[PDB]
Amino acid sequence: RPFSDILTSIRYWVIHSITVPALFIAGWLFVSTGLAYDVFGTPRPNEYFTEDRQEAPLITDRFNALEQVKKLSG
Amino acid sequence: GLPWYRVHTVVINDPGRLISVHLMHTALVSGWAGSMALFEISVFDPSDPVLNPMWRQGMFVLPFMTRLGITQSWGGWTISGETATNPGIWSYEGVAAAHIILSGALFLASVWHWTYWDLELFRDPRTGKTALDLPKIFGIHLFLSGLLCFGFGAFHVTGVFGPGIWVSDPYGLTGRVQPVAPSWGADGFDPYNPGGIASHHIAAGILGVLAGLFHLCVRPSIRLYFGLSMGSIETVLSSSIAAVFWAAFVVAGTMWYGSAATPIELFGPTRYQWDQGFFQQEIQKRVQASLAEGASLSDAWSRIPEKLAFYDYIGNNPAKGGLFRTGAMNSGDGIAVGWLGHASFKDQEGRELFVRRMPTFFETFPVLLLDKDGIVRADVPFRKAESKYSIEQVGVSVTFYGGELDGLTFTDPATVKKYARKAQLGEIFEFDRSTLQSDGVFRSSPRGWFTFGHVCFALLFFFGHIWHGARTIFRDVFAG
Amino acid sequence: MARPNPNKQVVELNRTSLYWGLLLIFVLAVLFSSYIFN
Amino acid sequence: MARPNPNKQVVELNRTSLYWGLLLIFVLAVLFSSYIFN
Amino acid sequence: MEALVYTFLLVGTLGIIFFSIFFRDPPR
Amino acid sequence: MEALVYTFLLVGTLGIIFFSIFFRDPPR
Amino acid sequence: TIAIGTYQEKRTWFDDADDWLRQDRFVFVGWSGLLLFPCAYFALGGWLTGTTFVTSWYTHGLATSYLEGCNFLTAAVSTPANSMAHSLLFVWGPEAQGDFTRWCQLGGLWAFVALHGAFGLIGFMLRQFEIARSVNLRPYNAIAFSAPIAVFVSVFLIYPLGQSGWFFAPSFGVAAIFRFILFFQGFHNWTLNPFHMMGVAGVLGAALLCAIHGATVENTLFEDAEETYSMVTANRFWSQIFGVAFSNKRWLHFFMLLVPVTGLWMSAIGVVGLALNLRAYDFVSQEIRAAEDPEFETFYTKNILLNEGIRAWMAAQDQPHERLVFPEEVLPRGNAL
Amino acid sequence: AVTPSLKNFLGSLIAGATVLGGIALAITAVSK
Amino acid sequence: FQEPGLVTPLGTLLRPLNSEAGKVLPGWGTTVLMAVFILLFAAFLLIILEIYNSSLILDDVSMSWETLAKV
Amino acid sequence: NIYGLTATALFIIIPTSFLLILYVKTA
Amino acid sequence: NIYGLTATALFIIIPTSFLLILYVKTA
Amino acid sequence: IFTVRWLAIHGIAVPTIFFLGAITAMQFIQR
Ligand code: CLA
Ligand code: CLA
Ligand SMILES: C=Cc1c(C)c2cc3nc(c4c5[nH]c(cc6nc(cc1[nH]2)C(C)=C6CC)c(C)c5C(=O)[C@@H]4C(=O)OC)[C@@H](CCC(=O)OC/C=C(\C)CCC[C@H](C)CCC[C@H](C)CCCC(C)C)[C@@H]3C
Ligand SMILES: CC(C)=CCC/C(C)=C/CC/C(C)=C/CC/C(C)=C/CC/C(C)=C/CC/C(C)=C/CC/C(C)=C/CC/C(C)=C/CC/C(C)=C/CC1=CC(=O)C(C)=C(C)C1=O
Ligand SMILES: CCCCCCCCCCCCCCCC(=O)OC[C@H](COP(=O)(O)OC[C@@H](O)CO)OC(=O)CCCCCCCCCCCCCCC
Ligand SMILES: CCCCCCCCCCCCCCCC(=O)OC[C@H](COP(=O)(O)OC[C@@H](O)CO)OC(=O)CCCCCCCCCCCCCCC
Ligand SMILES: CCCCCCCCCCCCCCCC(=O)OC[C@H](COP(=O)(O)OC[C@@H](O)CO)OC(=O)CCCCCCCCCCCCCCC
Ligand SMILES: CCCCCCCCCCCCCCCC(=O)OC[C@H](COP(=O)(O)OC[C@@H](O)CO)OC(=O)CCCCCCCCCCCCCCC
Ligand SMILES: CC1=C(/C=C/C(C)=C/C=C/C(C)=C/C=C/C=C(C)/C=C/C=C(C)/C=C/C2=C(C)CCCC2(C)C)C(C)(C)CCC1
Ligand SMILES: CC1=C(/C=C/C(C)=C/C=C/C(C)=C/C=C/C=C(C)/C=C/C=C(C)/C=C/C2=C(C)CCCC2(C)C)C(C)(C)CCC1
């Protein structure tokens, strides 16, 4: 299927013109609404240093690491 | 004519000469084994198996013999230390002579097979051209390998007929050869259980016997026969090299991380034991238990064996040597002679201080003395640098508990500085560097050298596998 | 005794090969002797 | 420039000559080094 | 005496270069 | 270390003898 | 013997799958594609997602992502903390226990990227073999490509396995790779190692050969089958100028192939040597001579002093798990010498 | 015997088997 | 070249083994068994690797130097 | 440093001699 | 004894190599 | 309509445009 025919097709143009902005705004909202911070766990600029911990985190655990990160996080 | 790098390709389609060259290589290997064992015995010093074990003398081939029960020497001396019973026929010199004799016999066999290369055995009965039935040859050889594996598992290691194998306590204090009872539960799969080795060898031998019998009784399929091209012999070489470097990787890993097949009694401690404070934790727990019994601090510390304290020394760490720092470990920092004692540092006020042990990854770590809380209180400043918390200003003092210098105390700034620098490395020891003119730089125990060499060969053999597989798959275009 | 071996061949290498080999050995030597002596 | 030299010749020496030469140098060496070291 | 060994190696390498330059094997 | 030098000279000489025996030039 | 040499026999489903896979399409799927396209794809994703959203605030105590305000150079995918040791960090493993957010926080994404990328490299060189077989050509490309696989395995897999854990492996990122380079310089004295010397010689010689061959071929073209460029003219020119010139085209192109592969293989052997801390770090004779005679001083002594400075001034923050605090009087300085 | 890690390993194993089966079924269906 | 090789008692004893080189079965043979057993061996190797790595913890398994004293 | 001297001497002598013998045989 | 070692080494290298060069040229 | 080329291009592109939108919005975030 040569590229020229698909490029000149009207159906292609309309469907891509309606979908591309949808994905663009989807990403915009996904980052601006803060869902990215929660899903990927990156702290926002105002909770890097919780009041209990004023230094950088440190793990010191291999198996029992989950609640360790819970304590370090938040 | 052929290039310099193809001279050995003549034997590809000449089975007799192939047999001859393989015998000759086996002869070289056995002769190396014998000669290295003889030199090994000629150089070894069994005077002090406590603070001068075999692994500190650059003993590479002897530990493998020691692992499988051979402990007695014809010279009377024994690895355990005593003179023991009569050596018997099976001794280190015995194994060396046996390997040399075997190498010579294989040399004669190789010469015989070289002279007589044309044999009806290799010729196809149907057609005059020479042919080799690779699947069936594999069948016989796998059958033999399975039989040998089952025999080793059920007779030698098990102790039913043989002596068994080496086993030692977790902390490598007392260890020697015994029979091993096979373990069939899940506990037999952990790396640190000899019964795992016994059960493994038995089961692997049985399954190898079954697989060899099958490959003997059944012939390949046409689709497989032409896809894998088992007609040619090159594919066999490629697959063999693949399995070989897999084995090399596995063996190197098992050596480096430590397993029941490499006891620290005769291979040296592993670096991860020093990193995680294995022996340090052991000594601390034992001394704490002794103190709880009511004995005084000096009395409690005096109970610790010299061997256990020696294992907690940075010098005994394979990850500290140098690529070109050749020689035995003793050539690096002398031969250990006695243990001075656990050195405790206390400041003028009374608080106890502890030197920050050098991490295994550094080479010149500055010395710091830490308080129980974890705050730096004293430290030797950089050379000819400004001083604020040096030894003199704080005036720390050192007292030795246990060992040779038990009870003695010192307050001289130079002496305490030197002893703090020493304790940085772990437990302090007295070394007679004059005997071998020790250069003062650490070397790598046999474990590190074995791992290095075998991993390098593993990579090279991966490349060899790729090359020979490439030639095999592309035979037609390569030929012309 | 067996008949003469059919697949007998001889090895050859021209002057370029000799120069390459000698240069390789000498370069490796000058590179590694510094560490061998230590 | 002058014309090509007419009496230009090339030196040759066969394998026997090489073996003789090497054996002479090595024999002289083994004989005299014992005194050179002294 | 290591210095003499180093100079020997360097001069030998230079000799190999010289011989490769001026005494080339004519093609075929 | 003179021993190694002497041994090198001796084994080198034996090598020359061996090559002169087995690797002879066929005359003409 | 029982049947013919696999001409037709029966059209089993395997034959149909093979025919579909090896179709002459825009993209050659092939069998190796089943192993290459998925894994490699994930690897790329595993990096880009890793560079974009997740953070390294817990493994290394650093901010390495666009979300936290990092340039393209600074952003990176950080290795798991040293506590994780040599765990493979399976998302279903005990460390993460199926919690994706905590799996990302612990740094398992680095392990994801590394493992899937290694398998992608395997699939790629299998693809090279497959296409070479399909076109009836010698697979010298696979032999050439074996070198980068060797370097990747020796640097990203063998090295951390030889060290305490994954923590000391390179972290995917430009600034991270620069940190790794300076880290080897400071601790292992990697520049002094003979194997690195041989590898750098190979690499620079490869670049030299590329440039010279391009210039020579482009400057001996015939006026306008037969070879476009005059080989005799080029041979004469490079024999007059340099002294030695190539006489056989096949040998020349094979040499171009041979140089870089050897260089990188030797460098990989050197990195393997470092993985066990077997480092060509010191000359004992020079060190003792400098010790006995303070006046004596060479460039090597200055390099050793610089390495000491690097270690002392970087270990404070490069290895947080050690909890290292250095009093200001302890850090090396030039004037204190 | 019923430790959670074994459960997770078996889950991963069945997931990989599912992936392989899906790929094989897709290849067979698309081919014919 | 047509003349066969030397005749030996061991040689004639061992002829039956190296006698039908090239003989092959029709069809796919037992390749399904190869699928099954390759997969089983892969599972076994994965079990061992996760046992040694400690990523798979078992109640009986201790996976440490302290287990030498045990049994 | 005797080990270094002997190792270096062997590495110079054995392989270069090896090559020279082959080349002499070729011509 | 450095002088003896260097003299011996020179006497083994220069003349034998000299012979080898000529022989290589002849063949 | 569902060719492998289509699948490849869409699988590459869709995350690409999604991430470009995410990044451009991400740049405007007040620090
Ligand atoms: C089981 C191991 C094994 C076996 C049986 C073979 C057998 C063969 N190989 Mg393969 N090969 C192997 C491993 C093996 N190889 C590995 C590991 C590599 C990667 C390094 C290669 C790379 C390789 C290449 C690139 C080529 C071959 C070729 C060949 C054929 C001719 C041998 C040759 O090169 O001329 C004889 C070689 C020499 C006389 C030179 C030896 C000098 C060496 C390099 C230095 C001395 C080393 C030392 C004395 C011994 C080290 C021992 C160490 C292993 C512990 C022959 C069929 C050639 C071939 O088939 O082409 C048609 C070919 O081109 N091999
Ligand atoms: C062919 C492509 C391919 C390959 C080679 C890999 C390979 C890998 N992946 Mg990736 N992955 C893939 C596709 C692939 N994956 C796809 C398509 C997805 C999206 C769904 C993922 C998503 C993914 C994640 C999210 C993770 C991995 C991880 C891993 C690693 C561990 C896998 C493991 O141990 O599981 C177990 C392995 C197997 C099941 C392999 C087969 C073993 C045999 C065949 C089992 C035989 C059992 C039995 C006989 C059959 C079942 C019978 C039963 C029905 C009764 C490994 C490097 C993990 C990792 O290490 O990351 C750090 C991880 O976290 N992958
Ligand atoms: C840093 C230098 C460097 C790079 C980036 C590079 C890259 C490449 N070389 C290739 C080929 C080659 N390279 C070759 C020789 C060499 N290549 C060299 C050095 C490099 N080669 C050197 C020095 C040599 C000499 C030996 C050969 C002989 C070939 C080829 O045949 C091949 C080709 O055809 O080129 C056009 C391509 C392989 C495609 C691929 O990975 O398949 C897809 C596989 C994937 C995606 C899996 C790998 C995943 C990786 C390992 C995980 C990390 C991914 C992150 C994005 C990493 C980011 C890191 C940050 C620091 C930025 C690719 C374009
Ligand atoms: C007292 C004194 C003497 C002081 C010396 C001090 C001192 C420091 C000495 C240097 C020490 C030293 C030698 C160190 C280097 C050691 C070192 C690291 C060696 C690496 C060795 C090694 C085995 C590494 C393996 C890697 C390897 C394979 C590298 C190869 C490098 C190499 C040879 C590259 C090629 C270089 C080169 C100049 C090629 C040009 C080729 C050329 C003439 C092409 C021209 C040309 C082009 C055409 O296109 C066509 C068509 C034709 C026809 C043609 O002709
Ligand atoms: C204990 C027993 C002894 C053990 C040791 C045995 C050693 C055996 C001999 C090994 C060496 C063989 C050498 C062959 C040498 C040789 O003649 O090879 C020639 C070969 C090409 O030859 P051809 O195949 O074209 O020749 C066809 C026929 O005519 C035969 O030559 O080149 C190579 O394959 C690579 C050569 C080495 C690499 C060359 C380039 C890189 C090195 C140069 C670096 C210079 C420095 C640059 C940076 C500063
Ligand atoms: C500083 C610059 C360098 C200075 C040094 C230069 C050195 C130049 C080379 C000198 C050496 C030349 C050697 C030629 C060697 C050579 O090839 O000669 C060959 C020559 C006979 O050759 P033809 O004349 O028959 O050959 C004709 C042509 O084919 C060319 O050979 O024999 C001699 O004249 C005597 C040779 C030495 C004496 C041989 C017998 C006695 C010594 C052997 C003793 C063995 C031990 C027995 C007792 C244990
Ligand atoms: C006015 C300019 C003066 C320049 C002087 C410098 C000249 C350098 C000549 C290098 C020749 C290397 C040996 C070639 C041996 C030889 O005979 O090669 C011959 C070879 C050509 O081979 P053919 O094409 O005839 O091969 C045909 C095939 O069938 C194989 O025979 O030359 C090349 O391919 C290029 C090699 C460049 C390699 C450059 C390496 C440079 C290393 C320098 C090391 C210095 C160490 C210093 C220590 C202090
Ligand atoms: C069939 C696959 C279906 C899609 C699986 C999900 C993929 C998307 C992942 C997004 C993150 C979700 C976070 C939960 C992550 C998660 O799924 O954990 C689920 C589970 C652990 O969860 P728990 O046991 O704690 O949960 C208990 C219940 O509430 C059920 O979750 O782990 C597994 O049993 C295996 C999961 C494998 C999932 C990865 C599939 C790929 C395996 C590797 C295949 C290699 C094949 C190689 C062939 C040669
Ligand atoms: C005949 C006989 C006899 C005797 C015999 C003998 C005595 C033998 C010996 C033998 C021997 C005595 C052998 C030896 C061998 C050795 C070897 C085989 C070695 C090898 C080596 C190698 C291979 C190396 C390598 C290397 C090096 C050098 C280092 C590093 C690198 C490398 C790896 C390269 C008698 C009379 C009794 C009787 C009859 C039989
Ligand atoms: C992890 C994960 C996964 C997967 C993932 C993936 C698959 C991803 C992908 C991803 C992707 C696929 C991404 C992409 C991205 C892209 C980007 C991010 C781009 C960018 C670009 C740019 C930035 C550009 C720029 C430029 C240009 C070139 C043009 C103009 C100029 C400039 C320079 C501006 C899994 C399933 C395993 C699990 C879950 C999670």
UniProtKB/TrEMBL annotation, chain H:
TM segment ranges: 9-30
Q: Which domain of life is it from?
A: Eukaryota
- Sites where the protein binds chlorophyll a: 17
Q: Quote the protein name from its UniProt record.
A: Uncharacterized protein
Q: Which organism is it from?
A: Chlamydomonas reinhardtii
Q: What is the lineage of its organism?
A: Eukaryota, Viridiplantae, Chlorophyta, core chlorophytes, Chlorophyceae
